Design goal:
monomer; mainly alpha; elongated
Amino acid sequence: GHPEIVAAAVAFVRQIWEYARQGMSLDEMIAWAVKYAKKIFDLVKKMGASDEVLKKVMDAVLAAAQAYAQQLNDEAAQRLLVAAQVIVQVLQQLGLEHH
């Protein structure tokens, strides 16, 4: 029950969509993705949110990326989807490290 965290995660994906639209390199987009994944996980951890919340956040990140890929040219959309996959991979691993 933390819709503000889900909305924050979507907003971070929107930031990376802006980066992609501006022609940002894939390597820099991934660097931003990792930074934002850590920020998103901190929200989950500091709010004492459940594993279920973390799963809802991961689902929203992927869905947000798929949505915003429709507002990009082919290459930028491909890069956004890679960056968003990295966000979810980092979130999942941080959740496992948390226990």
